[PDB]
Amino acid sequence: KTKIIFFDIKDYDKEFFKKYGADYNFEMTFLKVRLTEETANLTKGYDVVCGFANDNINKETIDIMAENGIKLLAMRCAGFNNVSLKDVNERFKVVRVPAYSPHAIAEYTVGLILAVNRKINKAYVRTREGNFSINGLMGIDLYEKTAGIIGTGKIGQILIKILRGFDMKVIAYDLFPNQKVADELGFEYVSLDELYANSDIISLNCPLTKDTKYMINRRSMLKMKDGVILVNTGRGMLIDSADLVEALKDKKIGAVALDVYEEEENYFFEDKSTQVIEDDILGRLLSFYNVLITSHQAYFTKEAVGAITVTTLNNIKDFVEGRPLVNEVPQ
Amino acid sequence: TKIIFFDIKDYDKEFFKKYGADYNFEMTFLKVRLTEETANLTKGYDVVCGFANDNINKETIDIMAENGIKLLAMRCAGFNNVSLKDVNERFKVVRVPAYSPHAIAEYTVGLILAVNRKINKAYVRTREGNFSINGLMGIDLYEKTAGIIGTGKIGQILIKILRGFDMKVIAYDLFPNQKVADELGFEYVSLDELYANSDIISLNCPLTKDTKYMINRRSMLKMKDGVILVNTGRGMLIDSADLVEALKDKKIGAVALDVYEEEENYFFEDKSTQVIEDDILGRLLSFYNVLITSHQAYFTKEAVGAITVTTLNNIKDFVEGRPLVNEVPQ
Amino acid sequence: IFFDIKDYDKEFFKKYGADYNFEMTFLKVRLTEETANLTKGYDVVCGFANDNINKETIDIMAENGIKLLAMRCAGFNNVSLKDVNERFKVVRVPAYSPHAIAEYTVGLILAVNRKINKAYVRTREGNFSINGLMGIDLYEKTAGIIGTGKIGQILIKILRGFDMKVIAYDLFPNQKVADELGFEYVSLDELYANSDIISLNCPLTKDTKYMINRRSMLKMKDGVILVNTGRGMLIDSADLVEALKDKKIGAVALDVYEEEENYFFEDKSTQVIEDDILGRLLSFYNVLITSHQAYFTKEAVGAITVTTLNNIKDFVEGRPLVNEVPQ
Amino acid sequence: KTKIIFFDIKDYDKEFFKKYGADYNFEMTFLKVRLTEETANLTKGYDVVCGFANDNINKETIDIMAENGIKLLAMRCAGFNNVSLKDVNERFKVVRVPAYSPHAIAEYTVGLILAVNRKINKAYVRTREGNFSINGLMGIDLYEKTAGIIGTGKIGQILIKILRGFDMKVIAYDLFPNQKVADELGFEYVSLDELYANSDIISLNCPLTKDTKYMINRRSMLKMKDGVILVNTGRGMLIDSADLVEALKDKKIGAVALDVYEEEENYFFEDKSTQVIEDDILGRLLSFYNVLITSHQAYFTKEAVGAITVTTLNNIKDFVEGRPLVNEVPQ
Ligand SMILES: NC(=O)C1=CN([C@@H]2O[C@H](COP(=O)(O)OP(=O)(O)OC[C@H]3O[C@@H](n4cnc5c(N)ncnc54)[C@H](O)[C@@H]3O)[C@@H](O)[C@H]2O)C=CC1
Numbered sequence A, D: 001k002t003k004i005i006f007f008d009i010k011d012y013d014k015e016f017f018k019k020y021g022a023d024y025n026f027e028m029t030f031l032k033v034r035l036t037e038e039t040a041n042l043t044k045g046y047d048v049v050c051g052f053a054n055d056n057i058n059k060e061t062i063d064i065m066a067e068n069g070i071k072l073l074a075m076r077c078a079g080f081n082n083v084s085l086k087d088v089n090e091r092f093k094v095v096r097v098p099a100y101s102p103h104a105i106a107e108y109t110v111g112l113i114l115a116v117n118r119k120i121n122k123a124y125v126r127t128r129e130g131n132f133s134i135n136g137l138m139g140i141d142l143y144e145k146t147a148g149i150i151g152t153g154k155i156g157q158i159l160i161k162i163l164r165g166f167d168m169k170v171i172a173y174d175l176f177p178n179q180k181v182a183d184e185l186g187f188e189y190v191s192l193d194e195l196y197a198n199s200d201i202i203s204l205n206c207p208l209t210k211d212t213k214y215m216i217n218r219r220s221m222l223k224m225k226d227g228v229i230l231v232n233t234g235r236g237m238l239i240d241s242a243d244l245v246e247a248l249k250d251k252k253i254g255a256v257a258l259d260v261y262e263e264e265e266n267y268f269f270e271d272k273s274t275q276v277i278e279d280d281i282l283g284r285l286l287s288f289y290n291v292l293i294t295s296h297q298a299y300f301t302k303e304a305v306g307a308i309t310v311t312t313l314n315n316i317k318d319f320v321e322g323r324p325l326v327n328e329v330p331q
Numbered sequence B: 001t002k003i004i005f006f007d008i009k010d011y012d013k014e015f016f017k018k019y020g021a022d023y024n025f026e027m028t029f030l031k032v033r034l035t036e037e038t039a040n041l042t043k044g045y046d047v048v049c050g051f052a053n054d055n056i057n058k059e060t061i062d063i064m065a066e067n068g069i070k071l072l073a074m075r076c077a078g079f080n081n082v083s084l085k086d087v088n089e090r091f092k093v094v095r096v097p098a099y100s101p102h103a104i105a106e107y108t109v110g111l112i113l114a115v116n117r118k119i120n121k122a123y124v125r126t127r128e129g130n131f132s133i134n135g136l137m138g139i140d141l142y143e144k145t146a147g148i149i150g151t152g153k154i155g156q157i158l159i160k161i162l163r164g165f166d167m168k169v170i171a172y173d174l175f176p177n178q179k180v181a182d183e184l185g186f187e188y189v190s191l192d193e194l195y196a197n198s199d200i201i202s203l204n205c206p207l208t209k210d211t212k213y214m215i216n217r218r219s220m221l222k223m224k225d226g227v228i229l230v231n232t233g234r235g236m237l238i239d240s241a242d243l244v245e246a247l248k249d250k251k252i253g254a255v256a257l258d259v260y261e262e263e264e265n266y267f268f269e270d271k272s273t274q275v276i277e278d279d280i281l282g283r284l285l286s287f288y289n290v291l292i293t294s295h296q297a298y299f300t301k302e303a304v305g306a307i308t309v310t311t312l313n314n315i316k317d318f319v320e321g322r323p324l325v326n327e328v329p330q
Numbered sequence C: 001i002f003f004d005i006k007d008y009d010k011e012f013f014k015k016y017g018a019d020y021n022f023e024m025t026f027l028k029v030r031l032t033e034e035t036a037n038l039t040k041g042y043d044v045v046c047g048f049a050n051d052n053i054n055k056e057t058i059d060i061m062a063e064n065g066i067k068l069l070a071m072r073c074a075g076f077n078n079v080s081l082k083d084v085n086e087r088f089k090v091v092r093v094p095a096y097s098p099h100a101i102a103e104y105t106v107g108l109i110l111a112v113n114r115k116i117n118k119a120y121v122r123t124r125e126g127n128f129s130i131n132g133l134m135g136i137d138l139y140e141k142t143a144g145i146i147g148t149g150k151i152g153q154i155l156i157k158i159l160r161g162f163d164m165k166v167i168a169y170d171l172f173p174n175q176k177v178a179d180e181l182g183f184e185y186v187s188l189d190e191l192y193a194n195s196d197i198i199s200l201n202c203p204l205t206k207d208t209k210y211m212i213n214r215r216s217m218l219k220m221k222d223g224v225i226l227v228n229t230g231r232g233m234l235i236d237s238a239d240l241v242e243a244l245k246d247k248k249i250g251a252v253a254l255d256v257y258e259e260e261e262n263y264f265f266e267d268k269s270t271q272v273i274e275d276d277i278l279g280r281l282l283s284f285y286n287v288l289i290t291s292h293q294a295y296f297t298k299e300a301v302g303a304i305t306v307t308t309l310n311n312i313k314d315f316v317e318g319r320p321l322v323n324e325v326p327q
């Protein structure tokens, strides 16, 4: 009887929500379109809206939603940078799924590092055509190199542990360093500049905020070591992509793996192979021998997707029963 | 001192020229693999430098001793491809045993995650502008069981890394080392227990008489359905034909092979403008869940640097009558 | 009732059908003996080239009172006609666009000769080396066409424009057309011995099944370029693999494949391809496989939809059957 | 005896020139580098220089060559746009191979048309991964469509004949129309503007000159039919590539095949797959779903390459024996 409208849905999302939703007393409607100001009108008559990471939940969208009497905005993801929280004004509540599986993203990040370092993705395309030459595929041992992690949160700290198992030296930067964890894991907090100057490999694992937007830009990349391997499974807006293209052309950047991209919203998760990709930077990034782009799949495991579904359904059950909202996103 | 090198590529040559400039050697580089058909080209040389895919059987060894070869220097850790009994001490054999175990262990982890998370497939889709991720869902390695076969230099580093993923690790070795298993946090088990309880299995033992085709129809029937298998050891560890069947019957979830049982005429060479004659290799290349890379687990700067220097020193040490630290006993 | 439907099929049939007084039901699944039961309560069953319309399927269909089998294709080798027994009628679309297939055939020839597909994969990765991509001029070479029909004749005309010499084999030669087009009928053996390029454009029948097999390929010139936009069963695929391995076959393009029915038109990129020969064929440097898309142009598909839609409109109005397939 | 220096050589070139050159009284030296001002010095002590399509044979290069006493410049190609003829003040002679195989290029042009129309290259990349879906691969019948050929020379005429065999209607533009050939082939000369307005398919087969440089640019592409299929096996400089990108993005261009590219000289024929492609437009062109780029291989058949080698060697023999130079490029 609680009526739920879901945006940006794929078949994998739907199957999970139908299966696990069978034990909840919900009406579930599934839409393919992203939630934006153009589609916000479709929320009319629903109690709960379920949004995802690439929905444009700006003021206009939020106004139309409150106007339509929406009681709850449920985000089926850990990120909320794309919802303009100040504009909600407590006219409805916002919940997210914060800890479905930090391991999924940390593990993926390690995958991406090794893929671009050891050029696994290029190897595969060669051996498929029967090219078994390995010229140009030489990488570097991670062992005893320095990895620099920006964001020592749930994901960042698991990433650090893994890398320490590789016997990498790890340095890290966080707005709120946690020295205890550093002693347990065996890593040293440093400034951003020290991280840039000493890191052979750099990974972004902080949220997108006003302070992190474009934190990786021409100026910060000039401070990195030539041949630095950079990986981003955070948010696309962490990197000024145009500057990334230049730092690739300058051979500052040894290789880069991007699971997210600043203007990904009309592309990612969709098969755009039969039309023009209109974003110039995205097209150009796809033509670099040492760029690996994957469509925001760091989160994408069966454990992670399972927990997102269950935690999302419970977030909603908990709201309708007037229970305390453990996964509220404070506004 | 006159050195004949087989199976050489430009990356090998450049390294051996750069670092060999300090040593008093004549160095001749050949592209061709060392086999019975090419063994005759060793005539007039003091030292032969061989590599992992050379066929150094009795015929090859006989022709070499006949030509007065003093030293066989292997620029690799593996020596399964030298028929040691047939040497008869007519010349010495040296290898480079520990250039970089990290290179291979690290690459092994790279393969696991690539096939699990479909990173190679992702790339091929996004390059064509297909950003759909349907079918690319993987599994968290966290709290799964990895089973390592071969707890040597490489296998032990692999185990440590995976323990960092908080995987449970079980292992099998012909010569268990219980002490390392206590430090690392893993348990030796029989092969049968490994097969039954492993979500991921990695092969890191040498190719011997005992390991040849250990992974075959019968042992794969004991694995968990959906098992992820990775081989950076030797290709002959797997009966490849059975592997094909175990893929087709969906016993195998995904597999990454950095080596292959008949790789000798393919690997390291660009065969993209001719027929691949080996039927199994062609067929393996057509499976959605098979990742084949051309024996590049070892292939890092550090590893290749250390192979070159250790090889050149193996040879310097032999010619100066020094004790051979890296002899392979025969 | 429509089988083996894809979104392109559905959009066309809805757009053009929205004039006609029909209720149309669309199914994704192929028509086989397992799915034939789903025809219950329908009068029009619309089938396509890879449906298994054997006796069991036909029996279940007649049992369910099926009035018309409408084939949205020109080929009908997959419908066991003798078993229908006139318990319902069969219509096809015979001439929607012979040009579509003939033109595509020429595309394939040139793609495998000049390595265009391999070129694309290289340049996409920034490999602009053209080593191994050398081809041959078609000019003054000999092309051998098996099946001089609607498609075969247009193929011949195009190739004659390339100034290729053309020879051809047909069970029912048409000497006239040979004089207009400038080509010579020969035996199969002569075709095999003198052809640099060979194309198959005859129907799959009892007599053409496996006509390309180890024995006939041994008669071909080494380095022959072979293209098949006919039916997969024209080639013994296992022998093709051998003739590729022997380097008898210079390059081959297959738009059709003998066991294509559970693969073609479907995205199988997230599961095992169980057919061993198909997997193996995909690993050869000089094999080009496309998924039965020689017919696939907007004119062809438009004409298929209209001719089909008003093949049905001409059945329900008790009109004579302009496009039947005689049993 | 006669000493020949060859630039921009690949193994295929060398094998042909060694095989066929064994009968001629020549010393033959092979270099990998392109002939530019930076390399022109390497001509010192040679009688004959053999150049190829992407050599930068400007005045500086020509001056350094005449200074070194070079007697003959032999181009192993039909194009000569890249040699600044006015600057060669008859201080040496220039020969080319004009008619090695017009069929090779015309045939390849037809291959490209059908590949981008019927998506054969995209089909291949799909089926290789076991994607047999044909959605998005629908093309058009060429039958009864209009093809527009710019340049009715040796190549253009054979192209026209072939297309007439497809029963296409053909129109053509040439600076020097040949009405007789039009009557034999069945095509009509028209203005460029009429060609742009009525062509479904357009092919470029004129030389690169001062008059053809950038003839295909924003303005001319605005006159084409929406969804036009464009193919260029002429010269890269015939197209303002930046405008091409825009005309692709705005969907004026249905599909394009480029065998040549305006800044191809440091890329084409070379394996650049293990480094950054520094040219932005080329990278971007490689990321369009409906762009097919091949590396200047329209000429590349065994008959063509054979004839280039023999005709080149005879051009040179004929020069040294004071024979009249039938393949001189008038300066
Ligand atoms: N690609 C994908 O599928 C996924 C991406 N994400 C992204 O990864 C991000 C990290 O997530 P968690 O580890 O769960 O977040 P978290 O909220 O546990 O930890 C983030 C850490 O970043 C730090 N931080 C905050 N602002 C900072 C600043 N201005 N500079 C440096 N550090 C700062 C905090 O101290 C915190 O420790 C999420 O915000 C989300 O954007 C999350 C899940 C999946």
Ligand SMILES: NC(=O)C1=CN([C@@H]2O[C@H](COP(=O)(O)OP(=O)(O)OC[C@H]3O[C@@H](n4cnc5c(N)ncnc54)[C@H](O)[C@@H]3O)[C@@H](O)[C@H]2O)C=CC1
Pocket: B077, B078, B079, B097, B101, B104, B149, B150, B151, B152, B153, B154, B155, B172, B173, B174, B175, B204, B205, B206, B207, B208, B210, B211, B232, B233, B234, B258, B259, B295, B296, B297, B298, B299
């Ligand atoms: N893909 C690549 O590029 C490379 C592959 N390798 C392969 O890995 C092996 C070298 O590995 P390392 O760990 O450095 O060698 P190692 O000698 O350090 O370790 C070998 C381990 O396997 C064990 N072993 C021997 N027979 C066994 C059996 N039947 N069952 C289980 N374990 C057995 C040994 O007892 C030892 O614990 C080589 O033999 C080679 O075949 C080595 C280098 C590179």
Ligand SMILES: NC(=O)C1=CN([C@@H]2O[C@H](COP(=O)(O)OP(=O)(O)OC[C@H]3O[C@@H](n4cnc5c(N)ncnc54)[C@H](O)[C@@H]3O)[C@@H](O)[C@H]2O)C=CC1
Pocket: C074, C075, C076, C094, C098, C101, C146, C147, C148, C149, C150, C151, C152, C169, C170, C171, C172, C201, C202, C203, C204, C205, C207, C208, C229, C230, C231, C255, C256, C292, C293, C294, C295, C296
């Ligand atoms: N790949 C694709 O998308 C398409 C494939 N086709 C295939 O091509 C075949 C021919 O199509 P159409 O030219 O429209 O048919 P058609 O109108 O030409 O009739 C078939 C021709 O094949 C000849 N033929 C019959 N038996 C023969 C034998 N034993 N040996 C040699 N030749 C023989 C006939 O004499 C006739 O000239 C179709 O039956 C179908 O299988 C048709 C349409 C599309």
Ligand SMILES: NC(=O)C1=CN([C@@H]2O[C@H](COP(=O)(O)OP(=O)(O)OC[C@H]3O[C@@H](n4cnc5c(N)ncnc54)[C@H](O)[C@@H]3O)[C@@H](O)[C@H]2O)C=CC1
Pocket: D078, D079, D080, D098, D102, D105, D150, D151, D152, D153, D154, D155, D156, D173, D174, D175, D176, D177, D205, D206, D207, D208, D209, D211, D212, D233, D234, D235, D259, D260, D296, D297, D298, D299, D300
């Ligand atoms: N992609 C490749 O591999 C190859 C490309 N080419 C290109 O194709 C051209 C050679 O074609 P061919 O047909 O052998 O040349 P051709 O010299 O036989 O014919 C050239 C035609 O272009 C016409 N033309 C000249 N200036 C013109 C202008 N300003 N506007 C319009 N038309 C004009 C001429 O009247 C003549 O009909 C070369 O000049 C070269 O640029 C040639 C060989 C290979």
